[PDB]
Amino acid sequence: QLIPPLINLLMSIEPDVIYAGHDNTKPDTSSSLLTSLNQLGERQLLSVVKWSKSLPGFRNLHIDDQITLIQYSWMSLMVFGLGWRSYKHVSGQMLYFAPDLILNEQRMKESSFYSLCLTMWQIPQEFVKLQVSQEEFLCMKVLLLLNTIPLEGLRSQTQFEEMRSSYIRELIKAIGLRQKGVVSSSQRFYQLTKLLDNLHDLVKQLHLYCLNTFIQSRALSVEFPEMMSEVIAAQLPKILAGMVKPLLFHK
Protein backbone atom coordinates (compact mmCIF):
# COMPACT_ATOMS: atom_id res chain seq x y z
CA GLN A 1 0.00 0.00 0.00
CA LEU A 2 2.28 2.76 1.27
CA ILE A 3 5.54 0.79 1.24
CA PRO A 4 7.09 1.09 -2.25
CA PRO A 5 7.39 -2.16 -4.30
CA LEU A 6 11.19 -2.05 -4.57
CA ILE A 7 11.52 -1.60 -0.81
CA ASN A 8 9.25 -4.56 -0.08
CA LEU A 9 11.38 -6.59 -2.51
CA LEU A 10 14.57 -5.57 -0.68
CA MET A 11 12.97 -6.57 2.62
CA SER A 12 12.09 -9.91 1.05
CA ILE A 13 15.58 -10.66 -0.25
CA GLU A 14 17.44 -9.65 2.92
CA PRO A 15 19.28 -12.80 4.03
CA ASP A 16 18.19 -14.76 7.13
CA VAL A 17 20.48 -14.09 10.13
CA ILE A 18 23.87 -15.78 9.87
CA TYR A 19 25.42 -17.65 12.81
CA ALA A 20 29.15 -17.56 13.43
CA GLY A 21 29.22 -21.14 14.70
CA HIS A 22 31.24 -19.77 17.63
CA ASP A 23 32.21 -21.93 20.64
CA ASN A 24 31.25 -19.73 23.61
CA THR A 25 31.77 -22.53 26.15
CA LYS A 26 35.53 -21.85 25.98
CA PRO A 27 37.49 -18.72 27.04
CA ASP A 28 37.70 -16.46 23.97
CA THR A 29 41.27 -15.45 23.13
CA SER A 30 42.04 -12.52 20.86
CA SER A 31 43.13 -14.82 18.03
CA SER A 32 40.24 -17.26 18.50
CA LEU A 33 37.85 -14.31 18.43
CA LEU A 34 39.28 -12.99 15.14
CA THR A 35 39.24 -16.48 13.68
CA SER A 36 35.57 -16.79 14.62
CA LEU A 37 34.81 -13.36 13.14
CA ASN A 38 36.53 -14.43 9.91
CA GLN A 39 34.42 -17.62 9.78
CA LEU A 40 31.34 -15.41 10.20
CA GLY A 41 32.71 -13.12 7.47
CA GLU A 42 33.10 -16.11 5.12
CA ARG A 43 29.47 -17.05 5.76
CA GLN A 44 28.30 -13.47 5.25
CA LEU A 45 30.29 -13.15 2.02
CA LEU A 46 28.35 -16.09 0.58
CA SER A 47 25.16 -14.43 1.80
CA VAL A 48 26.14 -11.14 0.13
CA VAL A 49 26.77 -12.75 -3.24
CA LYS A 50 23.46 -14.65 -3.06
CA TRP A 51 21.69 -11.42 -2.10
CA SER A 52 23.23 -9.60 -5.06
CA LYS A 53 21.88 -12.20 -7.51
CA SER A 54 18.36 -11.23 -6.41
CA LEU A 55 19.02 -7.47 -6.18
CA PRO A 56 17.09 -5.62 -8.89
CA GLY A 57 19.39 -4.45 -11.66
CA PHE A 58 22.61 -5.93 -10.34
CA ARG A 59 22.63 -9.12 -12.43
CA ASN A 60 22.35 -6.95 -15.50
CA LEU A 61 25.74 -5.30 -15.02
CA HIS A 62 28.66 -6.99 -16.72
CA ILE A 63 29.84 -9.98 -14.66
CA ASP A 64 33.26 -8.41 -14.16
CA ASP A 65 31.57 -5.32 -12.73
CA GLN A 66 29.39 -7.42 -10.42
CA ILE A 67 32.47 -9.18 -9.10
CA THR A 68 34.43 -5.91 -8.78
CA LEU A 69 31.61 -4.17 -6.86
CA ILE A 70 31.34 -7.04 -4.34
CA GLN A 71 35.12 -7.14 -3.86
CA TYR A 72 35.17 -3.37 -3.24
CA SER A 73 32.23 -3.26 -0.89
CA TRP A 74 32.04 -6.44 1.16
CA MET A 75 33.62 -4.84 4.26
CA SER A 76 31.34 -1.81 4.04
CA LEU A 77 28.23 -3.95 3.65
CA MET A 78 29.19 -6.21 6.52
CA VAL A 79 30.05 -3.45 9.00
CA PHE A 80 26.85 -1.61 7.98
CA GLY A 81 24.88 -4.81 8.65
CA LEU A 82 26.65 -5.16 11.99
CA GLY A 83 25.51 -1.62 12.75
CA TRP A 84 21.91 -2.43 11.93
CA ARG A 85 21.82 -5.65 14.00
CA SER A 86 23.48 -3.90 16.95
CA TYR A 87 20.95 -1.06 16.72
CA LYS A 88 17.93 -3.38 16.41
CA HIS A 89 18.80 -6.11 18.92
CA VAL A 90 20.82 -4.39 21.63
CA SER A 91 19.97 -0.71 21.19
CA GLY A 92 23.44 -0.11 19.80
CA GLN A 93 25.01 -0.87 23.15
CA MET A 94 26.89 -4.06 22.14
CA LEU A 95 28.24 -5.26 18.76
CA TYR A 96 25.84 -7.91 17.54
CA PHE A 97 28.05 -9.74 15.01
CA ALA A 98 25.76 -12.78 15.08
CA PRO A 99 23.27 -14.29 17.55
CA ASP A 100 26.08 -16.54 18.86
CA LEU A 101 28.71 -13.81 18.74
CA ILE A 102 27.72 -10.63 20.57
CA LEU A 103 30.57 -8.46 21.88
CA ASN A 104 30.55 -6.06 24.83
CA GLU A 105 33.43 -4.03 26.30
CA GLN A 106 34.47 -6.90 28.59
CA ARG A 107 35.18 -9.18 25.62
CA MET A 108 37.31 -6.64 23.77
CA LYS A 109 40.52 -7.11 25.73
CA GLU A 110 42.97 -6.48 22.89
CA SER A 111 43.59 -2.73 22.84
CA SER A 112 44.02 -2.59 19.03
CA PHE A 113 40.83 -4.59 18.41
CA TYR A 114 38.87 -2.60 21.02
CA SER A 115 39.94 0.54 19.26
CA LEU A 116 38.67 -0.93 15.99
CA CYS A 117 35.37 -1.85 17.64
CA LEU A 118 34.90 1.72 18.88
CA THR A 119 35.29 2.80 15.28
CA MET A 120 32.70 0.26 14.19
CA TRP A 121 30.46 1.37 17.07
CA GLN A 122 30.06 4.76 15.40
CA ILE A 123 27.53 3.31 12.99
CA PRO A 124 24.99 1.87 15.50
CA GLN A 125 25.40 5.15 17.39
CA GLU A 126 24.37 7.22 14.40
CA PHE A 127 21.56 4.74 13.73
CA VAL A 128 20.27 5.36 17.25
CA LYS A 129 20.71 9.13 16.99
CA LEU A 130 19.01 9.44 13.60
CA GLN A 131 16.47 6.66 14.28
CA VAL A 132 17.08 5.12 10.83
CA SER A 133 14.18 3.05 9.55
CA GLN A 134 14.28 -0.44 8.08
CA GLU A 135 13.18 1.09 4.74
CA GLU A 136 15.96 3.68 4.77
CA PHE A 137 18.58 1.13 5.83
CA LEU A 138 17.66 -1.23 2.97
CA CYS A 139 18.18 1.45 0.29
CA MET A 140 21.32 2.77 1.91
CA LYS A 141 22.83 -0.74 1.90
CA VAL A 142 22.37 -0.97 -1.87
CA LEU A 143 23.97 2.43 -2.32
CA LEU A 144 26.96 1.12 -0.38
CA LEU A 145 27.32 -1.77 -2.81
CA LEU A 146 27.46 0.86 -5.54
CA ASN A 147 29.66 3.35 -3.68
CA THR A 148 33.09 2.72 -5.21
CA ILE A 149 34.17 2.03 -8.79
CA PRO A 150 37.47 1.53 -10.66
CA LEU A 151 39.53 4.55 -11.68
CA GLU A 152 38.68 3.74 -15.30
CA GLY A 153 35.02 3.20 -14.47
CA LEU A 154 32.95 0.07 -15.03
CA ARG A 155 32.32 -1.79 -18.31
CA SER A 156 28.59 -1.25 -17.73
CA GLN A 157 28.99 2.34 -16.52
CA THR A 158 25.73 3.52 -18.10
CA GLN A 159 23.70 0.71 -16.55
CA PHE A 160 25.51 1.34 -13.27
CA GLU A 161 24.63 5.04 -13.26
CA GLU A 162 20.96 4.28 -13.91
CA MET A 163 20.94 1.66 -11.17
CA ARG A 164 22.52 4.00 -8.65
CA SER A 165 20.03 6.79 -9.52
CA SER A 166 17.09 4.40 -9.16
CA TYR A 167 18.21 3.49 -5.65
CA ILE A 168 18.89 7.10 -4.71
CA ARG A 169 15.31 7.78 -5.75
CA GLU A 170 14.17 4.82 -3.70
CA LEU A 171 15.99 6.12 -0.60
CA ILE A 172 14.08 9.39 -1.10
CA LYS A 173 10.79 7.46 -1.11
CA ALA A 174 11.85 5.62 2.05
CA ILE A 175 12.58 8.97 3.69
CA GLY A 176 9.20 10.25 2.51
CA LEU A 177 7.41 7.45 4.34
CA ARG A 178 8.07 9.29 7.61
CA GLN A 179 9.55 12.66 6.64
CA LYS A 180 6.57 14.80 5.69
CA GLY A 181 8.35 18.16 5.62
CA VAL A 182 9.85 19.07 2.24
CA VAL A 183 12.86 20.55 4.01
CA SER A 184 12.84 18.05 6.87
CA SER A 185 12.94 15.29 4.25
CA SER A 186 15.63 17.25 2.43
CA GLN A 187 17.69 17.64 5.59
CA ARG A 188 17.08 13.92 6.19
CA PHE A 189 18.44 13.05 2.77
CA TYR A 190 21.48 15.17 3.58
CA GLN A 191 22.07 13.40 6.89
CA LEU A 192 21.72 9.90 5.49
CA THR A 193 23.92 10.55 2.46
CA LYS A 194 26.50 12.28 4.65
CA LEU A 195 26.59 9.11 6.77
CA LEU A 196 27.32 7.03 3.65
CA ASP A 197 30.11 9.46 2.68
CA ASN A 198 31.61 9.14 6.15
CA LEU A 199 31.65 5.35 5.86
CA HIS A 200 34.57 5.59 3.41
CA ASP A 201 37.02 6.83 6.05
CA LEU A 202 35.60 4.43 8.63
CA VAL A 203 35.92 1.39 6.35
CA LYS A 204 39.50 2.34 5.49
CA GLN A 205 40.53 1.65 9.09
CA LEU A 206 38.80 -1.73 8.93
CA HIS A 207 40.56 -2.45 5.57
CA LEU A 208 43.96 -1.61 7.04
CA TYR A 209 43.43 -3.71 10.18
CA CYS A 210 42.23 -6.65 8.06
CA LEU A 211 45.13 -6.57 5.59
CA ASN A 212 47.63 -6.30 8.46
CA THR A 213 46.11 -9.25 10.33
CA PHE A 214 45.93 -11.20 7.06
CA ILE A 215 49.66 -10.66 6.42
CA GLN A 216 50.47 -11.64 10.03
CA SER A 217 47.86 -14.41 10.17
CA ARG A 218 50.34 -17.22 10.84
CA ALA A 219 52.07 -15.14 13.52
CA LEU A 220 48.80 -14.08 15.13
CA SER A 221 47.34 -17.57 14.86
CA VAL A 222 44.37 -16.09 12.97
CA GLU A 223 42.79 -18.23 10.24
CA PHE A 224 41.17 -16.65 7.16
CA PRO A 225 38.85 -18.87 5.07
CA GLU A 226 39.29 -19.24 1.29
CA MET A 227 36.65 -16.91 -0.15
CA MET A 228 37.58 -14.10 2.23
CA SER A 229 41.26 -14.64 1.55
CA GLU A 230 40.51 -14.30 -2.17
CA VAL A 231 38.69 -10.97 -1.96
CA ILE A 232 41.36 -9.56 0.36
CA ALA A 233 44.19 -10.57 -1.94
CA ALA A 234 42.33 -9.49 -5.08
CA GLN A 235 41.58 -5.92 -4.02
CA LEU A 236 42.54 -4.70 -0.53
CA PRO A 237 46.03 -3.46 -1.32
CA LYS A 238 44.67 -1.57 -4.37
CA ILE A 239 41.78 -0.10 -2.38
CA LEU A 240 44.06 0.97 0.49
CA ALA A 241 46.51 2.57 -1.91
CA GLY A 242 43.59 4.67 -3.16
CA MET A 243 43.62 3.25 -6.69
CA VAL A 244 39.81 3.32 -6.83
CA LYS A 245 37.20 6.05 -7.16
CA PRO A 246 35.07 6.49 -4.03
CA LEU A 247 31.70 8.00 -4.99
CA LEU A 248 30.66 10.85 -2.72
CA PHE A 249 27.28 12.56 -2.29
CA HIS A 250 28.84 15.70 -0.89
CA LYS A 251 31.81 17.58 -2.33
Ligand SMILES: CC(=O)[C@H]1CC[C@H]2[C@@H]3CCC4=CC(=O)CC[C@]4(C)[C@H]3CC[C@]12C
Ligand atom coordinates in the same frame (compact mmCIF):
# COMPACT_ATOMS: atom_id res chain seq x y z
C1 LIG B 1 40.31 -10.48 11.33
C2 LIG B 1 40.22 -9.01 11.10
O1 LIG B 1 41.16 -8.40 10.64
C3 LIG B 1 38.92 -8.27 11.46
C4 LIG B 1 39.02 -6.70 11.44
C5 LIG B 1 37.64 -6.17 10.91
C6 LIG B 1 36.74 -7.43 10.98
C7 LIG B 1 35.43 -7.40 10.19
C8 LIG B 1 34.54 -6.24 10.70
C9 LIG B 1 33.15 -6.20 10.03
C10 LIG B 1 32.44 -7.55 10.09
C11 LIG B 1 31.17 -7.59 10.46
C12 LIG B 1 30.41 -8.82 10.44
O2 LIG B 1 29.22 -8.83 10.80
C13 LIG B 1 31.04 -10.10 9.89
C14 LIG B 1 32.55 -10.11 10.21
C15 LIG B 1 33.29 -8.83 9.72
C16 LIG B 1 33.44 -8.83 8.15
C17 LIG B 1 34.67 -8.75 10.46
C18 LIG B 1 35.57 -9.97 10.14
C19 LIG B 1 36.94 -9.91 10.87
C20 LIG B 1 37.69 -8.60 10.54
C21 LIG B 1 38.13 -8.53 9.03
